[PDB]
Amino acid sequence: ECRKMFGGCSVDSDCCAHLGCKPTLKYCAWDGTF
Numbered sequence: 001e002c003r004k005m006f007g008g009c010s011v012d013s014d015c016c017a018h019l020g021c022k023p024t025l026k027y028c029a030w031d032g033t034f
Contacts (some may be wrong), residue, residue, distance in 0.1 A: 003028045 002016035007028050008023035013027030018028050022029050 005030045 003014055003019065004016060005019070006029065007015060007019075008026060009015050009028050010026065011020050014021050018032040019028035019030050021027070
């Protein structure tokens with residue numbers, strides 16, 4: 001039960017792989033390639 005793009009989180013360890021909770025915002029921003 002992890003989080004995905006536009007899922008909503010608080011800490012970096014609150015989303016699935018290839019995702020990162022935005023520090024300025026509050027959601028998992030997928031950044032695998034970019």
